[PDB]
Amino acid sequence: TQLIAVLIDDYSNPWFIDLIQSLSDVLTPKGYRLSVIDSLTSQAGTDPITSALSMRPDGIIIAQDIPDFTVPDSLPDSVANDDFRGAEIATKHLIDLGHTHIAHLRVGSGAGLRRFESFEATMRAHGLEPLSNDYLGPAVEHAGYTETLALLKEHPEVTAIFSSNDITAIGALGAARELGLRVPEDLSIIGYDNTPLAQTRLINLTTIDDNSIGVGYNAALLLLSMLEIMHTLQPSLIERGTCAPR
Amino acid sequence: RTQLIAVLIDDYSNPWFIDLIQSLSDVLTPKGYRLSVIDSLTSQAGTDPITSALSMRPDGIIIAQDILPPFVIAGTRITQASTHDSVANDDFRGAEIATKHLIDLGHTHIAHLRVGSGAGLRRFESFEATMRAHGLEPLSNDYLGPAVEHAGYTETLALLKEHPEVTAIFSSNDITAIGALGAARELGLRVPEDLSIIGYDNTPLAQTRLINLTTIDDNSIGVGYNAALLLLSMLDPEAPHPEIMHTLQPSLIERGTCAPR
Numbered sequence A: 001t002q003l004i005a006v007l008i009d010d011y012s013n014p015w016f017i018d019l020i021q022s023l024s025d026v027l028t029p030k031g032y033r034l035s036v037i038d039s040l041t042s043q044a045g046t047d048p049i050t051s052a053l054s055m056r057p058d059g060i061i062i063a064q065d066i067p068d069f070t071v072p073d074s075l076p077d078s079v080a081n082d083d084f085r086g087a088e089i090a091t092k093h094l095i096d097l098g099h100t101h102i103a104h105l106r107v108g109s110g111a112g113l114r115r116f117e118s119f120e121a122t123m124r125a126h127g128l129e130p131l132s133n134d135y136l137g138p139a140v141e142h143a144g145y146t147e148t149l150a151l152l153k154e155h156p157e158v159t160a161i162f163s164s165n166d167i168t169a170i171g172a173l174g175a176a177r178e179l180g181l182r183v184p185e186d187l188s189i190i191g192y193d194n195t196p197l198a199q200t201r202l203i204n205l206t207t208i209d210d211n212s213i214g215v216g217y218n219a220a221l222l223l224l225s226m227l228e229i230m231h232t233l234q235p236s237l238i239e240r241g242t243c244a245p246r
Numbered sequence B: 001r002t003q004l005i006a007v008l009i010d011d012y013s014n015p016w017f018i019d020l021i022q023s024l025s026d027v028l029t030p031k032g033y034r035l036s037v038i039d040s041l042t043s044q045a046g047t048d049p050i051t052s053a054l055s056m057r058p059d060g061i062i063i064a065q066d067i068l069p070p071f072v073i074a075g076t077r078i079t080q081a082s083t084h085d086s087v088a089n090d091d092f093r094g095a096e097i098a099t100k101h102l103i104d105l106g107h108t109h110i111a112h113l114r115v116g117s118g119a120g121l122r123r124f125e126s127f128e129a130t131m132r133a134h135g136l137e138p139l140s141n142d143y144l145g146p147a148v149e150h151a152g153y154t155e156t157l158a159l160l161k162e163h164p165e166v167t168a169i170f171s172s173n174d175i176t177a178i179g180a181l182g183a184a185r186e187l188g189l190r191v192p193e194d195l196s197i198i199g200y201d202n203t204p205l206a207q208t209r210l211i212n213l214t215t216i217d218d219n220s221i222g223v224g225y226n227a228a229l230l231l232l233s234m235l236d237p238e239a240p241h242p243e244i245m246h247t248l249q250p251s252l253i254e255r256g257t258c259a260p261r
């Protein structure tokens, strides 16, 4: 069929956009065509793989669930950025800027769990007590908003927030706006993913590049080899306008 | 049959389709159908998304792109052609509401950021007709490209430089408006204190507290709902044909980006 099914979780979280563009840049020239299946609307149940199989795809890119994001399969093995390192970079950046009361907005995915663990480990290694919310649900803007308003009410001493991802950070930025907190003058916020949203002049969010372009590239090469290279890509800091020394 | 329905959209970067697909899903999945999305920028090397959709051998196809198994065009339509196989909001009415809102707020130097799509053309035409109906000379940029945030940003910076007298902007859609809001920020213009901006689509982005964008609800939920019912009526011609709305009414959603005078 020359069809490749690409599974993602939520169209509302644009972390996957340049990853699919990268996958496409590698696969389409080879004659392949891509179709997307999500976890919220493609089917009534919780069986996205069954939906993928119904199109009789030549291969599948799995960029959902909790494990390592992006796992290529023949028909019946993972490429991802180093989440521990990414979270370390984000946390260290806030520390180097002089922040002591730093909080983490967590998410319940596999990547989120790793970023949370790295956050705590990095804070303690640098002599600081970590603070995180207990939210273990999916990464959504609304939760980022209400979780941030709650977090800052309970801990007004917080001066910087490392959000597990960009979509959650959009919520945090909204919370800051509602609270009248200037970003970055009063509160620093750093996200993760470097989504197209973070790239806009309006949002202009400091974030950890999750190398989603590289992940899509190597994932595609790996799938092609089924139909050397590093399976763990390096993240990096992209400084924009949401962080400042303090 | 495969119980598969292919859904074609243009760009994942423009979230106008999100609640439309959710609505389509709410109607189709309980009946055993599964959905897969085909876009116009990454699903294939060329510009033949229909061929991509056909490769999965879908039972039906929802075409929500600006451009064989049974299909329904959702979110847009050919201004000339019949509406028998399309479900969309009334763009002329929506643009009229947006423009009239700015006019009723006391703005006279109103500008429109246009998009080159079928819906874009309709919104531009209505913008001009509404402005002239109220004795005002319409002003719009010349951009006839696709709806993307970056273009909204640079087009707005250029528009306001050429016409600093402009006090309000009716953006053809929300994603373009995000660019306009960024331009205002870059220019040091407070929204809405200095500049009013109204979008179109009521995207999830417009709904956030951070963006809090005044916009025209394109009834994308109603479109997805009726489009699903319409497609089902074609897939099962022997089953009773329900009451289907081919043209849904848009409405104004006031948030924080517009203000009087």
Ligand SMILES: [Mg+2]
Pocket: A015, A018, A193, A194, A195, A209, A210, A211, A212, A213
């Ligand atoms: Mg990324």
Ligand SMILES: [Mg+2]
Pocket: B016, B019, B201, B202, B203, B217, B218, B219, B220, B221
């Ligand atoms: Mg809508």
